[PDB]
Amino acid sequence: NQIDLNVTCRYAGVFHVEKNGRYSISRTEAADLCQAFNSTLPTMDQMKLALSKGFETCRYGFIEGNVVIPRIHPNAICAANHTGVYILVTSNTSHYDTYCFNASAPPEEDCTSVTDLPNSFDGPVTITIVNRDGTRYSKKGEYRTHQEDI
Numbered sequence: 029n030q031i032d033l034n035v036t037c038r039y040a041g042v043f044h045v046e047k048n049g050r051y052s053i054s055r056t057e058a059a060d061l062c063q064a065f066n067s068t069l070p071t072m073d074q075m076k077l078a079l080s081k082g083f084e085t086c087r088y089g090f091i092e093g094n095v096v097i098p099r100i101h102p103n104a105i106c107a108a109n110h111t112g113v114y115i116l117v118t119s120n121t122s123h124y125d126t127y128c129f130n131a132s133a134p135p136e137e138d139c140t141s142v143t144d145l146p147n148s149f150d151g152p153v154t155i156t157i158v159n160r161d162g163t164r165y166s167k168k169g170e171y172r173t174h175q176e177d178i
């Protein structure tokens with residue numbers, strides 16, 4: 029197995045994770061993924077603070093309770109011109125990206141490279157953290173605890 033995890037800069041500890049392809053994480057896998065990063069699925073208030081510090085993406089992703097996109101600037105193809113933490117209301121489907129929250133991060137923007145999946149456990153997968161600047165960190169292990177996700 030090989031799994032690539034593209035991670036963004038953290039904003040008030042909140043970051044975005046894309047696994048392999050766009051929108052391929054379930055809600056259970058997302059919770060396990062954040063846990064592997066010693067993080068949690070963000071609360072809405074945590075996400076709102078991150079947005080205020082400059083966090084935005086053009087990707088739907090899990091937080092605690094909902095699927096959201098943080099938007100600073102209005103774009104027609106990113107939450108249909110909405111700004112703020114846009115909550116996904118209507119979808120047939122169950123697989124998105126995820127957000128995670130790391131309490132130990134700096135309070136503002138942190139674009140240093142993520143170098144580990146610290147809480148990952150023993151397993152057969154090559155897990156590679158890919159940062160936006162291309163710097164990579166790989167380890168062998170596993171983070172999924174539901175067979176359905178494997």
Ligand SMILES: CC(=O)N[C@@H]1[C@@H](O[C@@H]2O[C@H](C(=O)O)[C@@H](O[C@@H]3O[C@H](CO)[C@@H](O)[C@H](O[C@@H]4O[C@H](C(=O)O)[C@@H](O[C@@H]5O[C@H](CO)[C@@H](O)[C@H](O[C@@H]6O[C@H](C(=O)O)[C@@H](O[C@@H]7O[C@H](CO)[C@@H](O)[C@H](O)[C@H]7NC(C)=O)[C@H](O)[C@H]6O)[C@H]5NC(C)=O)[C@H](O)[C@H]4O)[C@H]3NC(C)=O)[C@H](O)[C@H]2O)[C@H](O)[C@@H](CO)O[C@H]1O
Nearest residue numbers: 050085086087088097103104105106107108109110117118
């Ligand atoms: C029913 C019903 O109809 N439903 C209603 C519902 O409608 C739905 O809305 C959805 C929505 O969320 O809007 C729609 O979903 C989208 O559909 C689109 C088409 O179908 C999809 O394309 C889109 O996917 C997203 O596309 C994006 C894209 O831009 O192509 C992707 O984002 C890009 O990702 C890239 C890779 O990561 C990024 O690099 C890029 O960011 C840009 O990067 C630039 C760069 O580096 O080149 C950068 O440019 C630099 O900028 C700096 C300044 O900061 C300069 O200094 C520098 O010079 C620049 N460099 C250059 C250019 O030289 C830019 O800053 C930066 O933007 C990403 N682009 C963007 C836009 O950020 C993204 O990854 C794809 O996911 C779909 N979107 C989503 C969210 O999935 C759907 O179609 C509809 O069904 C409504 O939402 C709802 C409203 O209530 O109502 C329902 O009824």
